[PDB]
Amino acid sequence: GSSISNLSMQTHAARMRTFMYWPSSVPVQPEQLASAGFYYVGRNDDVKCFCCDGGLRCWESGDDPWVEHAKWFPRCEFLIRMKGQEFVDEIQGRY
């Protein structure tokens, strides 16, 4: 079937609902994370992408979830369709 890792998390609205217990101390906001395909897994500040199942943690002030998505998980289909291969190639070219 579908390549999507977590079908229940395919909508922005559903991803946002997972952030009810997101610690307010974390400098990155639920809106920025959910927009970039991430949902909260309920431990610390751990998030996973609904499409590629890539996990990120230890968010710091000034982190851009889209940039982090492209840095670590460049072949994610959701990332490529939302931001484009040109964006992914640019981020990848920094490393």
Ligand X SMILES: CCO[C@@H]1C[C@@H]2CN(C(=O)[C@@H](NC(=O)[C@H](C)NC)C3CCC(F)(F)CC3)[C@H](C(=O)N[C@@H]3CCOc4ccccc43)CN2C1
Q: Which residues bind ligand X (CB under 6 A)?
A: 41, 46, 48, 55-60, 63, 68, 72
Residue 76 annotated as lining a ligand binding site = yes
Q: How far is the CB of 88 from Zn ion (least distance, A)?
A: 11
Backbone angles phi, psi at 89, to 5 degrees: -60, -40
Dist. CA 72–CA 42, nearest whole Å: 21
Q: How far is the CB of 72 from ligand X (least distance, A)?
A: 5
Residue 49 annotated as lining a ligand binding site = yes
Dist. CA 11–CA 58, nearest whole Å: 24
Binding residues for Zn(2+), by number, are: 49, 52, 69, 76
